[PDB]
Design a protein around this ligand. Structure first.
Ligand code: HEM
Ligand code: HEM
Lengths: 190, 190
């Protein structure tokens, strides 16, 4: 997967495992959730293409959102959309498969950086808007959580198991957006 | 309600109603949600005491969270908790009742400031930690949202009306934390 550099960041994350433990508690994430994010693992894998179509359908239809993928001239960069889609697709599986350990926090930082002016547009070596405003990263907690629900019910699990899979997805998305705020936030306010 | 200055803040918010419309769209919030956030009004109004206890039981049970309410000597400040609880309770009703107009946005900015080192600890004239790290404001989207669900189900309402109030609450919680990021974020990255 071009530009996907998990495990090989070259910068350690400015947040450690203790931060992650405390942030896990704040988000009500337990060993129960560890189990259930993995059940979402297997439920979502067959559907990843239809999931991405849904999200891209949402981004594409709102010009003020599609904007973050556009060449300086206002037109959407197809190459850029295509290349990010693959890493987004990977990220669904990563969220469900990976140990939330130091390597994982290393990539969280990496992902925060790439949304932010620090590294945005560098990975795919494109010319686009310098920065995605943090307001929209937070906003996206909703559609990224809520739209995953139907896809979790699909493969016919027990409604409780659906509900617990959704609940873990909600916690993990929230947890990650929270960490991705690091490059955006004033030093010492994070 | 001491410290409650909704509608009377000076320093008018740095985001206007065009920003609020674009952020509403990012969180999938429509006139349908205004209706159902208003229906959360009456369901929740009775139970406000109970809800406050739930959120206080969560914060109070995690030292790294209760800490933001603590005197230099590391014990919780009873005056600080009591005054914030009164405003917090009122906020539930506000989220439900207030038109999301410019006076609403002005207070949103005030709320962001009171969590940030800019205006934290000044409202109730207390001595407490200088700043609530932003990471916890995002994380709290989860507990504020999910713990509200059981309360919406209590007034015996239809499961789909329950689902619609909950979705509205979730959208409205994310949207607000998103606006509160403003004082935390580096200039021009919001
Ligand atoms: C819940 C919130 C969000 C999630 C879960 C999410 C997820 C992701 C992931 C996994 C990546 C790939 C990281 C990698 O390179 O491995 C990515 C990149 C990207 N996303 Fe987001 N994202 C969110 C918010 C947003 C928002 C609000 C926008 C703007 C509409 C956006 C647009 C982009 C863009 C333009 C990139 C490529 C940035 C670059 O040049 O490196 N994302 N996102
Ligand atoms: C979804 C996230 C959150 C929501 C919805 C929320 C809600 C509120 C509200 C409505 C107020 C009263 C503001 C006013 O009217 O003056 C307040 C104040 C306060 N909250 Fe939060 N809050 C959140 C995150 C947090 C977190 C993570 C903490 C730390 C554990 C925290 C602790 C406090 C403190 C210490 C104050 C008083 C600050 C001051 O003015 O000195 N809150 N919150």
């Amino acid at each position: 997967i071009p530009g996907y550099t998990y495990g090989e960041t070259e910068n350690r994350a400015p947040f450690n495992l203790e931060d992650l433990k405390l942030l896990k508690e704040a988000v009500m994430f337990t060993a129960e959730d560890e189990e259930y994010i993995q059940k979402a693992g297997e439920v979502l894998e067959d559907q990843v293409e239809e999931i991405l179509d849904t999200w891209y359908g949402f981004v594409g239809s709102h010009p003020h959102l599609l904007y973050y993928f556009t060449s300086p001239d206002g037109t959407p960069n197809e190459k850029y959309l295509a290349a990010v889609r693959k890493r987004f697709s990977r990220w669904i599986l990563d969220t469900s498969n990976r140990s939330y350990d130091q390597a994982w926090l290393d990539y969280q930082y990496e992902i925060g950086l790439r949304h932010h002016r620090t590294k945005k547009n560098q990975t795919d070596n494109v010319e686009s808007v310098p920065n995605i405003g943090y307001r929209y990263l937070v906003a996206f907690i909703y559609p990224i959580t809520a739209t995953m629900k139907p896809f979790l019910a699909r493969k016919g699990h027990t409604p409780e198991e659906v509900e617990k899979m959704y609940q873990a997805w909600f916690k993990a998305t929230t947890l990650q957006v929270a960490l991705w705020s690091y490059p955006y936030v004033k030093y010492g306010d994070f």
